[PDB]
């Protein structure tokens, strides 16, 4: 197992940032590529024993780094907004012999470039409680959560049920929907379903909590705009079980 | 200067279907074909290779086949279930690693077998916080297809299925959500095809 960070990124074009990946399997062959959507990943760098030994014509505003056996960097600075993409750390090569040959990816930095961060904008979430005509229908019960108006496109959505993440019964939108498709700057929605029994939600002692961690700004950028400064952070909407009325 | 041609860029099959993927190269010293799965939101994971010298691997479900006089090489799902649903990659090297030519990806889509259909679709509670008045198209046959709106605020989201994994069930779902005046539930997806005998409660 390889483990970057971080796992959103959204940039300036004068910002700099880091990208950390690390592997503690003792491969010695570390890999950087690049992966642009509906794409295969595209080699960037290659280290062997900490030595660079591949570059692929990687623009020096990438420049990489590998402190150590276990560690490899990649700097970011002068970013442009065809850069935005998925950075994936690999690593392969196990120690001498001892080992067969295999490669594993990390899950990537997803990064967006913009030109001008006037149009980062957090998230507006909302919880949606079961319909009650489902409740009698199906014996089941869906929320739904609704994230909206935000861009760009960096949300985690999680579902929290008394105060533990959970996966089952969840089905969240693969891709936002784009609220203006036509506009290039348009904010996005995200849809994301929790399913219970029946049972389950009419139990007003549980808990749901949809969680959208949003990517936004760093302290390091500036912001002269009169509303917010739509930084980094997390939005929340909860509900609570409703007994039989 | 090489490359590895990858058919189909889109493949739909049903759970319990078969699915089998086709790349051709052209690089004739190539001796290592890898296939890398790639999940939404995770990293590429290989899940399969074939070291060359032969013309079969197998791996419970999954299967490759190479022929290096023909230079094509293919994997195989047999009973496939909706994890297997990726974007698939097959690459082709002859140095390892460090010089894979990569297939240009097929996504793989492997809808469930849908038990009992019960279509239906469903007024969601309004939230203090929102405008929003949502509405949920659930429990359909797979068969069935969701188109989006035709109207300007109104956001309709693509099908989703989630597993209730204690009670072995899965199931499809559709969210359509406006602010609008004009908007309630027995039109929302009207530019789709329901089923005939969708249920409308009140
Ligand atoms: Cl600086
Ligand atoms: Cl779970």
């Not at chain 1, 594993?104 to 979430?125: C, M, Q, S």
């Not at chain 1, 929320?143 to 993440?165: Q, R």
């Not at chain 2, 469903?122 to 929102?130: H, I």
């Not at chain 2, 609008?180 to 409308?200: L, V, W």
Request: aromatic share 10%; proline share 6%.
């Amino acid at each position: 197992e390889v483990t970057q960070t971080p796992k959103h990124l959204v940039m300036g074009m004068t910002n700099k940032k880091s990208l950390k990946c690390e592997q503690h399997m003792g491969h010695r062959a570390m890999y950087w590529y690049k992966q642009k959507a509906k794409k295969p990943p595209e080699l960037m760098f290659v280290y062997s024993y900490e030595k660079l030994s591949i570059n692929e014509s990687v623009p020096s505003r990438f420049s990489p780094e590998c402190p150590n056996s276990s560690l490899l960097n990649l700097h970011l600075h002068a970013l442009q907004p065809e850069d935005s993409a998925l950075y994936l750390c690999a690593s392969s090569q196990p120690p001498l012999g001892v080992g067969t040959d295999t490669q594993y990816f990390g899950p990537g930095t997803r990064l967006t470039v913009l030109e001008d961060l006037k149009n980062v904008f957090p998230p507006e979430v909302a919880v949606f409680e079961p319909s009650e005509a489902e409740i009698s229908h199906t014996q089941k019960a869906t929320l739904v959560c609704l994230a909206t108006g935000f861009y760009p496109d960096h949300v985690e959505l999680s579902w929290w049920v008394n105060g533990k993440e959970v996966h089952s019964g969840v089905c969240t939108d693969p891709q936002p929907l784009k609220e203006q498709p036509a506009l290039n700057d348009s904010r996005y929605a995200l849809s994301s379903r929790l399913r219970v029994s029946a049972t389950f939600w009419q139990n007003p002692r549980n808990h749901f909590r949809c969680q959208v961690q949003f990517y936004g700004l760093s302290e390091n950028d500036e912001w002269t705009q009169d509303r917010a400064k739509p930084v980094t952070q997390i939005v929340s909407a909860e509900a609570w079980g409703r007994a039989d009325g | 200067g090489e490359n590895v041609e990858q058919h189909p860029s889109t493949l739909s099959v049903q759970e319990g279907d078969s699915a089998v993927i086709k790349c051709t190269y052209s690089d004739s010293a190539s001796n290592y074909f890898p296939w890398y799965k790639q999940e939404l939101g995770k990293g590429p994971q290989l899940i399969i290779d074939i070291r060359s010298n032969v013309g079969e691997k197998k791996d419970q479900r999954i299967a490759v086949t190479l022929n290096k006089t023909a230079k094509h090489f293919s994997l195989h799902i047999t009973e496939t279930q909706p994890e297997d649903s990726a974007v698939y990659f097959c690459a082709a090297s002859k140095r390892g690693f460090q010089k894979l030519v990569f297939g240009t990806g097929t996504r793989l889509l492997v809808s469930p077998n849908i038990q009992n259909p019960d279509p239906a679709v469903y007024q969601l509670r309004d939230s203090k916080s929102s405008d929003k008045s949502v509405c949920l198209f659930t429990d359909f046959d797979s068969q069935t297809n969701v188109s989006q709106s035709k109207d300007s605020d109104v956001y309709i989201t693509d099908k989703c299925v989630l597993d209730m994994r204690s009670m072995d069930f899965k199931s499809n779902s559709a969210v359509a959500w406006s602010n609008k005046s004009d908007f309630a539930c027995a039109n929302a997806f009207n530019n789709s095809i329901i089923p005939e005998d969708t249920f409308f409660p009140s």
